[PDB]
Design a protein around this ligand. Structure first.
Ligand SMILES: [Mn+2]
Length: 208
């Protein structure tokens, strides 16, 4: 009766090549994400929180037992973040959104190109491990970043920022070191080639 399972990827391990290497995809998924799933399930065992979806759980960290707060923040956080991450990438995806998402990007950031710059800048200036995010907050889009496995859905007091993510990029060095080593900006440039903007559009619609 374990709470979470490792999701299947929506594509093969080499589907994102050369932008993201196959070996990275496999380790990232089968070692790193799996560890977050396993440690989250351990932390949830003696609780009333094992039946909640992970995205609801991370919105309730203040309510869980005090001794399990850190472990769930880190591991439920890791699980939520990676689960989204696999889904917002895809193969055979210049790659950009359309329709209402693009309209929201133009009004929030000026243009898709200016949005990409702001997103990259957030991801670049994230010192240490973390994520950069495109969030819906008060019906409007913004770019924020978080430390480690914090997610904007955890709220401002915990994560330092708020909002409902519809896109994120993992800037933990494990996400890019085998292919780009220290060159995080090259990783980030490459990332735009794999974003599934149909998926991000669905998430935008879901988040308002
Ligand atoms: Mn990661």
């Amino acid at each position: 009766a374990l709470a979470y399972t490792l999701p299947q990827l929506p594509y093969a391990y080499d589907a994102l090549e050369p932008h993201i290497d196959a070996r990275t995809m496999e380790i990232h998924h089968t070692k790193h994400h799996q560890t977050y799933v396993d440690n989250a399930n351990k932390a949830l065992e003696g609780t009333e929180f094992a039946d909640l979806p992970v995205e609801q759980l991370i919105q309730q960290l203040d309510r869980v037992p005090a001794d399990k707060k850190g472990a769930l923040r880190n591991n439920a956080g890791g699980h939520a973040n990676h689960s989204m991450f696999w889904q917002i990438m895809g193969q055979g995806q210049a790659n950009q959104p359309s329709g209402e998402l693009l309209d929201a990007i133009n009004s929030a950031f000026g243009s898709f190109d200016a949005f990409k710059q702001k997103f990259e800048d957030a991801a670049k200036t994230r010192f240490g491990s973390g994520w950069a995010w495109l969030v819906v907050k008060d019906g409007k889009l913004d770019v924020v970043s978080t430390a480690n496995q914090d997610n904007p859905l955890m709220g401002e007091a915990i994560a330092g920022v708020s909002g409902t993510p519809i896109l994120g990029v993992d800037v933990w060095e494990h996400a890019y070191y085998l292919n780009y080593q220290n060159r995080r900006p090259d990783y980030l440039a490459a990332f735009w080639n794999v974003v599934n903007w149909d998926e991000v559009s669905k998430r935008y619609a879901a988040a308002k």
